[PDB]
C-alpha cells in the first residue's frame, strides 16, 4: 500500500479539524479548539487500491503564521479550505496557494479547493467565484460540510487522486 502525505490548510475557524475528524471518526466536532498541529492516519481503499493516508491538520490562527514552511515541505498534497460564510477566509486562500508554491518551488502541486460549511444557508462566497479561482489554479473545487459529511470523502479522496497522478 502507498502512503500519502495530505496537509489541510486555511484560515482559523473554517473547519479544517472538523473535516478531518469527520473523515477519521465519522464524528462532528462542535467545539472550536484552535489547532497547533495534529496528525491522523487512515487506511482506506480508493479506486480499488488500498491507501494509507497521513493527514496533517494545521493551525489557521495568524499567531502561528511563521511555522507553515516546515509542514509545507513534507506535504505531498494540500486541502485549501475556506468557509462559504466567511469572505475573509476566501481571500486568505491565495496566500496559502502562493506560499505552498514558494516552499515547494513548484507550479504543479496537488491541491483541492474546499468551500466548507455548505450546510449553512447564510452563504457569502458564491460557488462561481470559488470555481473561477480553482480553474485559475488548475484544481478542483468541492463544497463540503463537516457537520453532515456532504462532500467530505470526495474532497480528501480527490486530493489522493491528484497525488497519485502527480
Amino acid at each position: 500500500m502507498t502512503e500519502y502525505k495530505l496537509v489541510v490548510v486555511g484560515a482559523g475557524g473554517v473547519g479544517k479539524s472538523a473535516l478531518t475528524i469527520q473523515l477519521i471518526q465519522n464524528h462532528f466536532v462542535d467545539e472550536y479548539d484552535p489547532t497547533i498541529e495534529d496528525s491522523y492516519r487512515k487506511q482506506v481503499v480508493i479506486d480499488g487500491e488500498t491507501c494509507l493516508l497521513d493527514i496533517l491538520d494545521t493551525a489557521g490562527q495568524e499567531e502561528a503564521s511563521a511555522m507553515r514552511d516546515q509542514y509545507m515541505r513534507t506535504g505531498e498534497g494540500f486541502l485549501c479550505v475556506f468557509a462559504i460564510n466567511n469572505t475573509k477566509s476566501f481571500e486568505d486562500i491565495h496566500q496559502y496557494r502562493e506560499q505552498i508554491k514558494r516552499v515547494k518551488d513548484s507550479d504543479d502541486v496537488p491541491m483541492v479547493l474546499v468551500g466548507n460549511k455548505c450546510d449553512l444557508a447564510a452563504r457569502t462566497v458564491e460557488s462561481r467565484q470559488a470555481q473561477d479561482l480553482a480553474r485559475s489554479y488548475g484544481i478542483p473545487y468541492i463544497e463540503t460540510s463537516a457537520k453532515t459529511r456532504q462532500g467530505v470523502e470526495d474532497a480528501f479522496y480527490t486530493l489522493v487522486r491528484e497525488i497519485r497522478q502527480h
Binding site: 500500500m1 469527520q22 477519521i24 471518526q25 465519522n26 464524528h27 462532528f28 467545539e31 479548539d33 484552535p34 497547533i36 498541529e37 495534529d38 496528525s39 492516519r41 487512515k42 487506511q43 482506506v44 481503499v45 488500498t50 496533517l56 490562527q61 499567531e63 502561528a64 511563521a66 511555522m67 516546515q70 509542514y71 515541505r73 513534507t74 453532515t148 459529511r149
Partner: protein
C-alpha cells in the same frame, strides 16, 4: 543562523553531540538521547513532528516520571530573551527607537515556535493521555496552574482553549450516512430472549451483533494498558482491564462454539451445528471481523473438536474450503492475515494477540539505554517501535461499523458463560470427554445418539434479505 541563550541559563541550548544525541542513518530520526535532548526535539523550533509527540507521550513513562516531564517542559517554555545588540545600543543612546532585528527574529523563529510546541505537548497530553492526570490529582493541579498563568497575547488563544479542554476532560454520535441494514430474525422472534441460541438466532445477526460487541471491546483498549507489558504482570487486572475483558470475550465465544458442538451428541444435528458456525465465520470474513474469524478457527482446531472425523466428513465441501481459507490466514506466523488486514477497507476488528506479542518482544528484546562515550542515553528507537504498534492499533480503532445494535441479542452474548461455575481445567476436560463419548477412539465403533433439537435444523443462509 540565530544565536541561542547560554547553556548555563537555559539547558536546552547545549550543542548536539554524540554524548547527548544519536540520530538514525525530511527531518532527523532519533535513535537515542538524554531526556533533555529528547524534550528539545519534542518541541524543536525548526519543524513540527506531531507523530514524535504521540510516540513520546505514549512511551515516556519508562524513562521519565509524569511529574518530572511537566517540570522539564515548563523549563523548556521559559526562554530568556537576548539583550539589545550594538546597533540597538547606539540607537538607544541617540534617543531613537532600536530596530531590535535580532530580538524580533528570535521571538518569531525560536521563542514562539518552541512555546507553541510546548503547549501542543500539553494539549496532546491532556486530550489523549489524560490517565496521568486521573491517577495523580496534584499533576493536574500543576498543569492547570501552568496553563492558567501563561501570559502574553501570542499564546492567548491556545492557553484559553487548553484551559477549557482540561475542564471538559475532568467532567467527561456518528454520521454514516447510509442507513444500517435491517436486523434479521430466524426461529427466535424479537423479545423472546428465552429461546435465543446458536441455531435459533439468525446466523447473519449473530455475526453482526458479535462484530459490534467485539468492535466495541477492540476500540476500548488504551495504550496505557499496553506499554510496559503491563497486561502480563501482577497488576494486570488493574492496569489492563479493557484488554482483558476483550480477550475473555474471545475465549468465552471459542469455548461456547466447542460446547455447542460436543454437547450435540446426534451426528446429524452436530453437523448442522458445525455448518452453522462456519456460516457465521463467513459473515465474520465479510465484515472484516478477524477476531471473530479466529474465534471460530480456534474452536475448530481445539482438541475436542478437531478429532471429530465423522462430523468433518459430512460438512459440505464449500464449507470445508471456507474454513480452510480462514485457517490459512494464521499459517506461517499469520503471513496471510497480516497482508489481508493491510489490504481491506475498514471498519475491521483486528486480532489483538499479534500486537501483544510484538509489543512484549520489542520491550523484552531491546535495552532501555545505550551506553556511548561514557554516557547513558535513552534508547528511543525501542520506544518508537512500541509506538508504531500502538499507532497501528489506534488507526483501526477510528472507523465505526454501520450496523444496528439489537439490545437483547447483545445482552445474550454479553452474558454468555459456557464454563458456568467450573474452573478451566475441569471444563476443558469435560469437553474432551464429551468428544470421546460422541466419537470414540478407533477401533471402538460409532454409537448413535438421540436428537435434542425440536425445531428445524435448516439454516436460513447468510445472504441478507431486504423488504
Amino acid at each position: 543562523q540565530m544565536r541561542l541563550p547560554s547553556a548555563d541559563v537555559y539547558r536546552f541550548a547545549e550543542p548536539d553531540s554524540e554524548e547527548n544525541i544519536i540520530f538514525e542513518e525530511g527531518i532527523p530520526i532519533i535513535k537515542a538521547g538524554t531526556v533533555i535532548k529528547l524534550i528539545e526535539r519534542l518541541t524543536y523550533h525548526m519543524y513540527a513532528d506531531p507523530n514524535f509527540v504521540r510516540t513520546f507521550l505514549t512511551t515516556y513513562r519508562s524513562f521519565c516520571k509524569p511529574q518530572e516531564l511537566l517540570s522539564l517542559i515548563i523549563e523548556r517554555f521559559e526562554i530568556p530573551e537576548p539583550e539589545p545588540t550594538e546597533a540597538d545600543r547606539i540607537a538607544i543612546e541617540n534617543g531613537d527607537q532600536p530596530l531590535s532585528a535580532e530580538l524580533k527574529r528570535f521571538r518569531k523563529e525560536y521563542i514562539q515556535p518552541v512555546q507553541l510546541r510546548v503547549l501542543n505537548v500539553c494539549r496532546h497530553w491532556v486530550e489523549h493521555h489524560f490517565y496521568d492526570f486521573e491517577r495523580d490529582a496534584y499533576l493536574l493541579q500543576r498543569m492547570e496552574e501552568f496553563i492558567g498563568t501563561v501570559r502574553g497575547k501570542a499564546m492567548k488563544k491556545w492557553v484559553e482553549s487548553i484551559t477549557k479542554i482540561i475542564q471538559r476532560k475532568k467532567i467527561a454520535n456518528i454520521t454514516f450516512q447510509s442507513s444500517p441494514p435491517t436486523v434479521e430474525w430466524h426461529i427466535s422472534r424479537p423479545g423472546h430472549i428465552e429461546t435465543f441460541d446458536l441455531l435459533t438466532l439468525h446466523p447473519i445477526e449473530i455475526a453482526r451483533q458479535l462484530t459490534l460487541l467485539e468492535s466495541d471491546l477492540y476500540r476500548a483498549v488504551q495504550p496505557s494498558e499496553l506499554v510496559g507489558s503491563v497486561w502480563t504482570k501482577e497488576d494486570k487486572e488493574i492496569n489492563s482491564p479493557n484488554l482483558l475483558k476483550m480477550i475473555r470475550h474471545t475465549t468465552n465465544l471459542t469455548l461456547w462454539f466447542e460446547k455447542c458442538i460436543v454437547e450435540t451428541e446426534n451426528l446429524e444435528e452436530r453437523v448442522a451445528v458445525v455448518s452453522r458456525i462456519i456460516e457465521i465465520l463467513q459473515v465474520f470474513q465479510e465484515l472484516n471481523n478477524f477476531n471473530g474469524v479466529l474465534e471460530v478457527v480456534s474452536a475448530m482446531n481445539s482438541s475436542p473438536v478437531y478429532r471429530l472425523d465423522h462430523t468433518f466428513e459430512q460438512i459440505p465441501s464449500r464449507q470445508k474450503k471456507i474454513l480452510e481459507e480462514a485457517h490459512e490466514l494464521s499459517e506461517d506466523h499469520y503471513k496471510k492475515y497480516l497482508a489481508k488486514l493491510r489490504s481491506i477497507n475498514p471498519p475491521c476488528v483486528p486480532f489483538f494477540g499479534i500486537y501483544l506479542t510484538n509489543i512484549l518482544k520489542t520491550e523484552e528484546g531491546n535495552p532501555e539505554v545505550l551506553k556511548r562515550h561514557g554516557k547513558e542515553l535513552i534508547n528511543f528507537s525501542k520506544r518508537r517501535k512500541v509506538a508504531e504498534i500502538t499507532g497501528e492499533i489506534q488507526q483501526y480503532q477510528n472507523q465505526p461499523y454501520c450496523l444496528r445494535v439489537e439490545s437483547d441479542i447483545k445482552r445474550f452474548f454479553e452474558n454468555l458463560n459456557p464454563m458456568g461455575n467450573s474452573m478451566e481445567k475441569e471444563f476443558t476436560d469435560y469437553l474432551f470427554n464429551k468428544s470421546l463419548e460422541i466419537e470414540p477412539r478407533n477401533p471402538k465403533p460409532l454409537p448413535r445418539f438421540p436428537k435434542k433439537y425440536s425445531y428445524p435444523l435448516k439454516s436460513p443462509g447468510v445472504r441478507p434479505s431486504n423488504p
